[PDB]
Amino acid sequence: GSAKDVKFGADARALMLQGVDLLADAVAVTMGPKGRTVIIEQSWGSPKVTKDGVTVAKSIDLKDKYKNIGAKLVQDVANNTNEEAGDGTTTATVLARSIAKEGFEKISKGANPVEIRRGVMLAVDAVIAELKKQSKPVTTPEEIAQVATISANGDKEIGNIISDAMKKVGRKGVITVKDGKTLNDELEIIEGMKFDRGYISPYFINTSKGQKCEFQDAYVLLSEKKISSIQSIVPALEIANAHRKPLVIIAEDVDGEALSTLVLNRLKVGLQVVAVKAPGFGDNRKNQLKDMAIATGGAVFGEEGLTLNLEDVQPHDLGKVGEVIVTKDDAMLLKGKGDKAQIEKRIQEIIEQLDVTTSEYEKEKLNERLAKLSDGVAVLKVGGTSDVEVNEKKDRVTDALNATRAAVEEGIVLGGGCALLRCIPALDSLTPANEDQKIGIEIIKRTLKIPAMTIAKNAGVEGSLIVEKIMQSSSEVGYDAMAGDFVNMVEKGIIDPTKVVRTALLDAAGVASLLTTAEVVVTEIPK
Amino acid sequence: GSAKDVKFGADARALMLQGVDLLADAVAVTMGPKGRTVIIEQSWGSPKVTKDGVTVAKSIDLKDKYKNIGAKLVQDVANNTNEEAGDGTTTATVLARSIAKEGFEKISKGANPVEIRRGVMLAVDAVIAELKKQSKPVTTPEEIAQVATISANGDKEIGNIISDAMKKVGRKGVITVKDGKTLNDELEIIEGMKFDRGYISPYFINTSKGQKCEFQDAYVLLSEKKISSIQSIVPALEIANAHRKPLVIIAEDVDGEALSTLVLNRLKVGLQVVAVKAPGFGDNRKNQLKDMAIATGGAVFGEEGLTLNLEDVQPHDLGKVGEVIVTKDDAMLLKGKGDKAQIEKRIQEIIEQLDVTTSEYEKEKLNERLAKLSDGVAVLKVGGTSDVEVNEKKDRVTDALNATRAAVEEGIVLGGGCALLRCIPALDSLTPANEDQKIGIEIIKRTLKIPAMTIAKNAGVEGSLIVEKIMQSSSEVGYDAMAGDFVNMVEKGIIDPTKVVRTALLDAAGVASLLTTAEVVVTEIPK
Amino acid sequence: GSAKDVKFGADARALMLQGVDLLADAVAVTMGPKGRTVIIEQSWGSPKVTKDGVTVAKSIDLKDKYKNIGAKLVQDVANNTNEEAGDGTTTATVLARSIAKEGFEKISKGANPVEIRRGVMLAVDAVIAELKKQSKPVTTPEEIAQVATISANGDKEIGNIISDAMKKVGRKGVITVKDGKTLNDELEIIEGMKFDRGYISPYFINTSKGQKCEFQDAYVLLSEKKISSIQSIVPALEIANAHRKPLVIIAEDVDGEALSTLVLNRLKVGLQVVAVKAPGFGDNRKNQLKDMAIATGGAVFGEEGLTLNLEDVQPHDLGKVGEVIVTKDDAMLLKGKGDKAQIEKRIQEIIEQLDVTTSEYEKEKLNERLAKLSDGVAVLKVGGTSDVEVNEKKDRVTDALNATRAAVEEGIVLGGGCALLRCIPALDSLTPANEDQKIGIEIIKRTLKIPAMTIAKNAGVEGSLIVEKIMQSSSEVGYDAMAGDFVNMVEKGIIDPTKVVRTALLDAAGVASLLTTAEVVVTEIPK
Ligand SMILES: Nc1ncnc2c1ncn2[C@@H]1O[C@H](COP(=O)(O)OP(=O)(O)OP(=O)(O)O)[C@@H](O)[C@H]1O
Ligand SMILES: Nc1ncnc2c1ncn2[C@@H]1O[C@H](COP(=O)(O)OP(=O)(O)OP(=O)(O)O)[C@@H](O)[C@H]1O
Ligand SMILES: Nc1ncnc2c1ncn2[C@@H]1O[C@H](COP(=O)(O)OP(=O)(O)OP(=O)(O)O)[C@@H](O)[C@H]1O
Ligand SMILES: [K+]
Ligand SMILES: [K+]
Ligand SMILES: [K+]
Ligand SMILES: [Mg+2]
Ligand SMILES: [Mg+2]
Ligand SMILES: [Mg+2]
């Protein structure tokens, strides 16, 4: 409806490339062991100091809307890489800038940018196949410590404490990061669990920093049926809220009108309540529900056997937890106030059920329930002098945790950008169908050298010479930019998760190759 | 006396470097066989298209006076290289920019830039000594053709015609360049003379294109003594007024009172007249005077023997020339209208004088006089379609002539910037006296790679990789950027004059190392 | 000196292409039999209506200096085509625009525009050779009338009167164009003379419309020797001052003081005088001076035989002419007041001298002198109702005369742009040395279709379809754009001079391929 400005061809592509180049130039200074930090002014308080690429990317918006379009596209690259992998956002940003620049350079009258994008996608699929060929699984805790050390900008203490938390809890166990009042980082093992169901409505977020709902010493209400009716929730609301404590409502399916009343009580008067869907798709749902009620000290409502209704609720039928953390994709409970003897009885019942199962699939669920109820969770308190140092270290510790989980689930490859450098001969064996696919393959081939060049450039040396010497060396030799010398990467611990590398490459390639197909750009005229 | 703006330290150096970088970025696009051209708008008509570095440097002035200071200093580098060598101005410009940038980067509180300049000078002296050690004298006309071909941006026709002109006339003979009316270039051999005395007053310049006085079918007046009195020039100026041919007055020392009269008659009514000092010191001066008089048909006035006064001049005692060209440092006569028999008698007299002398010093003067009478003068007429193409081609022809004469004088070294690349181990063997001299030596060492990197960069390849592969290769192997491959440069003809390389390096180094000593910049406030 | 603005690469090239495109779009509307006219506002009086391409080109200057540079370069193309051939300036303009656009489109990082220019020159040489093979000489006066009709925008009356003037006077004879007081054009045969020597000083121009010096009923002074002394010109100038007829001074060589006095008298008080160099080299010069002194009724001064000095001049020793027209390169006398018996005696003497010559070179000079004395001068009086119509028609008549003389000199080819279309297979049989020469050859190959496409576009039809059907037809078939149908071009008389076509192509190609080598543009900042 509003008036629009329309730009065509080379001028529009140059303006979007200027926006892409500005955002990527800001992001790229943080890459590698010799990367620097970015200070972002916050509107409410102290400025934020970060080395995290997606944090820098999300904080940059440009007044020129043509440049802002390219900035938003590179921001999409960084955000998608952060959501899918939790690391490698700087790598994804510089790869996206490289693909966008080399694709913009190749636009001519006879060129077909859609087929160039098809060649880019084919080359990226070939590189991802080569990366999966080069990947090896993580077998030792030393590799875990090395991955967490590299991902935390070379901090050996973070790698050691993450390796210790993974040894004490498990490789698939849950580890969380929260603020510490001391100067040094500390690791504690406490009671709790995490399940992979997020919140149902986005109106319960009272902490806008992490988009999560955080309550302490809250009631948790369990039910086998869907907690729906007004005569089921309103007396429950009165009993739970009116006991000077918050409320957590775990149910099967919650969609309609009662949560709108919950949102009305949250926004107008300030009801501290949260509602989460229950996990499971069968009898495992009921088993985890009973385990929840035993661990929190609460009771199952609307069950088939006892038939306890939500119309008659008593305060002794509600579980008490020391903390509840609800995010978009998962929620978790800390320090339930349930009886220890009942938890031990349920654990022994789980042991007996494991002793009488051989289906090789219910054993997995029973072992998961036993690990959820037995070994506890890991909490990392990040020390530091001030809030800015603590937040920067939180960013690095979260990066290290995400990269360590990715390395556990999908293995490791050579770090320092050498893994992408070793996939160039896989591109050399490709036969393009036409000239535009050859252009796209060559774009990806010249893009694959960019992360190692950026890492070497941030170290103050010439990146092209370093990359050439890496390619002329054997397959195990790369460049330690911190020590500034050519070493065996595996024995020096400079390794990357395979998932992070392939996620960054795919997320950069899709958006940047889509961007290079543009001929016309339409913007609103500024008012 | 006007108001001034004063800037200190890093901001002033950054603005000066911005001006230096702007001028050097404009100049550097013309370097090498794949360099491009610069179009400069002319106020009086058609724009000029040039590949010549000093023309681009002279054509750029900046409104910001802090940037304009650095622009003027780099312009001084280019102009000094053009005056001293006639070639290599683009190389001097990029070397000066490199030295200025690395010197500005290395300035700290404890740094002493004067001692850094001392270390720069010591390193440049070492590199020039290595260049003299690496030089090879020119022995074959094929080397002459190769030098003239390389200096003329690679076309073999200019190199061949310059080689033919130097075969017909001689290695030390005089060759001139002027406009041609045909499409193709052509070489002619006509009879004439050249001596190394320029004009005495700058008011005789009629052609502002080359700051030279050009007359055709002109009178030549000769005298052994100084043409001094007013009554010595009143018959001469009366004959010039009464015979309609421009007057060339060659004398010993001309100053003060009647040169001012010639200026007055040139500016008010427009008398075509020029005054040149006589060449030689002693009997050689009067011998050359008699040679000029008998070659042009004129007579020597005020001589010791005949005692012919300047008060009584007859029209048959004045020489006639088909052309006279008077530049700042030399003068030339072409097509003297003298008797052939008298010239032949003078030539046989010179031969007989040589036959009875063995002094081995004035034998050189006698051979010079015989060459001036008998060897000939080459004229290159540059063909083309328009004035812009003709001027652009004459730039390269003049560059090739200057480089060929320099190669005759001082020999040849490897082209493509490889000669400077082979002087890096000479810097590696130096022991600096202190830290600042070490800084200057490292500045020169990193500067020595700049010309080859610029040549490779203009060829569309990565200059650092090319320079690394050259340095890892044998001493005879360099990079042909025209063919894009690594070749033996002597047998492929890619060679440079030694004088051009050392002149460009010295002229860049002195000015740029003086520039890097600055802390305070004082400019006038614009009105 | 003054502050400069420097632009790099694609933006500067786009700005100069905008200037080239604007000037060529203005010029191209006048092309062909259905071209339209351009009105140019004049500062002093009525606007000028023209179909002439170089007149439109020289009248356009742009405030944007970057666009004005390309405008000046295309103006140089048009001016060089007008000077060398006198026709085909619109064709040269559109060819130059085509070459500039296609060369600007083909510039990339790896492209070498200098070698592209070399390929352009090689392709243009091949096309010019093919045009010379395709050319045929003019044999019949019907071909003369057809050429003059085509060049005068289809005006058969102009072609007929030019053919009649060439039948009465000769194909190599002299024909002049001036204003007429009637409505229709007239042809008058007078007795007069023309030689190929222009004025010595450019200060003698009185009519700024055509840069020519025109006097009526003028004195003519001749001298075998150079008119040298002030004592030689003072009797002549006192006669020309007293006896009051404009003074034509024919001399051997004039460069000095008396011409400065002539210029001073021209500028201050207004002495209507002209000075022209003497034609010929040797005894032919003396014969011509005696011939024309007798033909004008004057006398030869300073001769070897009679020895008549320039100090004693009488009014009966000077010739009288009805008109004198002195341009930059040639001069003419009309209606010399000589004795008929003396001219007849000299003509019979020339016949007697022809009867005793067999060297086949002095016979040519004697026949030329006989044709000068007895052939006659044709004068075309151009009719019209007003000055603007007369000026437009005189532009067309001058174009027709230039094209007719070019067709006499070098023959004819097919008109309508078909001659350039038939040279495409000559480019198809070319093997380029590298990729850049291939790019230049392709540029010239696509450019060769532009004139016929422009002619068809001005006719209101689709040019590409017409050019495709011409190329698919036989070699003698072209497109009559006036009749709008495909005909035999020779049979219908749609023919062009070969010299005009090759001159336009060469003049466009040299400047436009030089322009496509630009990377940096330096302009003056406007004040
Ligand atoms: N000592 C080292 N030598 C060489 N490369 C190293 C070294 N330490 C880390 N790297 C490399 O640096 C890269 C990680 O850099 P960084 O963490 O700053 O960026 P990112 O993972 O792309 O983004 P972000 O952490 O901002 O989400 C990896 O490729 C890793 O292999
Ligand atoms: N085919 C080639 N391969 C490699 N280097 C080459 C080749 N041809 C020329 N060169 C190098 O290019 C340089 C000359 O470039 P150019 O003439 O443009 O600049 P310049 O001599 O520094 O300055 P200017 O000519 O503007 O006064 C020399 O170093 C020469 O060795
Ligand atoms: N009837 C016709 N059919 C086709 N082509 C024609 C016809 N008459 C003329 N032409 C062509 O038109 C062109 C002449 O156009 P025009 O005279 O307007 O331009 P020009 O010669 O390039 O420039 P200018 O006359 O302005 O100096 C020639 O190529 C000629 O062959
Ligand atoms: K980073
Ligand atoms: K150059
Ligand atoms: K026209
Ligand atoms: Mg990281
Ligand atoms: Mg040069
Ligand atoms: Mg015409």
**DSSP character string of A441-498:** HHHHHHHTTHHHHHHHHHTTS-HHHHHHHHHHS-TTEEEETTTTEEEETTTTT-EEEH
Residue B154 φ then ψ, to 5° = 90, -5
SS3 C488: strand
Distance between CA atoms of residues B55 and B185, nearest Å:
23
Contacts of B65 (CB under 8 A, 6+ apart): B523, B524, B526
CB C304 within 8 A of CB C224: yes
List the end-to-end C-alpha distance of chain C, in Å, as a whole number. 14
Annotated binding site of B for ATP: 51, 87-91, 416, 496
Residue of B nearest to A462 (CA): B464
Q: How far apart are CA C291 and CA C300, in angstroms?
A: 10
| Exposure b/e, A62-94, CB count within 10 A at least 16 = b | beebbbbbbbbbbbbbbbbbbebbbbbbbbbbb
* Separation of alpha carbons C309 and A296, rounded Å: 138
Ligand 3 site, CB within 6 A: C 30-33, 35, 52-53, 87-91, 150, 399, 415-417, 451, 455, 480-482, 494, 496
Dihedral (Cα; A110, A111, A114, A115), 10-degree rounding: 100
Q: Is B509 exposed, middle or buried (0-12, 13-18, 19+ CB in 10 A)?
A: buried
Taking the CA atoms of chain B, what radius of gyration do you get in angstroms? 26
> CB-based contacts of C89: which residues, under 8 Å, 6+ apart?
C27, C52, C53, C54, C57, C78, C81, C82, C504
Question: How many helices and strands (H and E) does chain C possess?
Answer: 20, 18
CB A439 within 8 A of CB A526: no
Chain B interface, best mutation among C5, C6, C253, by max B CB count within 10 A: C6
A493: closest CA of chain C, how far (Å): 40
What residues of B are in contact with residue A464 (Cβ under 8 Å)?
462, 464-465
Beta strands per DSSP E along B319-410: 319-326, 331-336, 377-382
* Whole-number Å distance between alpha carbons of B503 and B506: 5
Cβ atoms within 10 Å of C11's Cβ, excluding its own: 14
Contact A324, A215 (CB under 8 A): yes
DSSP sequence for A69-98: HHHHHHHHHHHHHHHHTSS-HHHHHHHHHH
Distance CA B259, CA B257 (A): 6
How, if at all, do strands B175-179 and B273-277 pair?
unpaired
Contacts of C253 in chain B (CB under 8 A): 217, 244-245
Tell me how far the alpha carbon of residue A107 is from its chain's centroid: 35
Q: Among B36, B243, B384, whose Cβ lies nearest the Cβ of C519?
A: B36
Report d(CA B412, CA B403) in Å as an integer: 10
Q: Measuring from atom 20 of ligand 1, which residue has the nearest CA? A: A88
Q: Which two tokens stand for residue C385?
A: 């109702």
User: Rounded to the nearest whole angstrom, what is the distance from the C-alpha of residue C255 to the centroid of ligand 5?
Assistant: 40
CA B428 to chain centre: 33
> Which run of H or E residues covers position A6?
strand A4-8
Residue type at A526 in one-letter notation: P
- Separation of alpha carbons C424 and C414, rounded Å: 14
Per the annotation, binding residues of C for ATP are: 51, 87-91, 416, 496
Rounded Cα distance between C78 and C80, Å, is 6
AA letter at B462: E
Amino acid type, B32: G
Identify whether the C-beta of residue C194 lies closer than 8 Å to the C-beta of residue C332: yes
Which atom of ligand 2 is nearest the CA belonging to B51? 26
* Chain B, chain C: beta-carbon pairs less than 8 Å apart: 147
The CA distance from B196 to B201, in Å, is: 16
Burial (CB < 10 A; 0-12, 13-18, 19+), residue B312, is exposed
Pocket test for ligand 3, best of C34, C393, C396, C455 (most atoms within 8 A of CB): C455
- Evaluate: CB of A150 within 6 angstroms of ligand 1: yes
Q: Would you call A201 exposed, middle or buried from its count of C-beta atoms within 10 A (0-12, 13-18, 19+)? A: middle
Mind giving me the DSSP string for B36-85?
Answer: -EEEE--TTSSPEEE--HHHHHHT---SSHHHHHHHHHHHHHHHHHHHHT
- Minimal C-alpha gap between A131 and chain B (Å): 27
Does B26 contact C261 at a Cβ distance shorter than 8 Å?
no
Closest Cα to atom 12, ligand 2: which residue? B32
Question: For C506, which of B37, B241, B385 is closest by C-beta distance?
Answer: B385
Lookup: tokens for A246: 């918050």
The C-alpha atoms of residue C315 and residue B349 are separated, in whole angstroms, by 54
The residue to mutate among B31, B93, B423, B482, having the most atoms of ligand 2 within 8 angstroms of its beta carbon, is: B31
Given a contact cutoff of 8 angstroms between Cβ atoms, the answer to whether A80 and A4 are in contact is: no
| Closest of B495, B506, B489, B487 to residue B447, by C-alpha | B506
Q: Which two tokens stand for residue B170?
A: 């001689």
Chains in touch with C (3+ beta-carbon pairs under 8 Å) read A, B
Pairwise CA distance, residues C199 & C362, whole Å: 27
Chain C contact set for A109 (CB, 8 A): 105
d(CA A519, CA A107): 10
Pairing of β A247-251 and β A273-277: parallel
Token digits of residue A348: 């022994």
CA angle, A396 then A392 then A503, to 5°: 40
Q: Using an 8 Å Cβ cutoff, are B385 and C506 in contact?
A: yes
| Number of other CB atoms surrounding residue A516 within 10 Å | 26
Instruction: Name C7's bridge partners.
Output: C521
Kindly state the DSSP code that residue A204 receives in the 8-state scheme. G
DSSP A50: E
Please state, as a whole number, how many other Cβ atoms lie within 10 Å of the Cβ of residue C441. Answer: 22
- Which of A465, A466, A472 best probes binding to B when mutated, by most B CB atoms within 10 angstroms? A465
Using DSSP, state whether A258 is helix, strand or coil.
helix
Q: How far does CA C231 lie from the centroid of its chain?
A: 40
Distance of alpha carbon C408 from alpha carbon C498, whole angstroms: 10
Ligand 1 site, residue A30, Cβ cutoff 6 A: yes
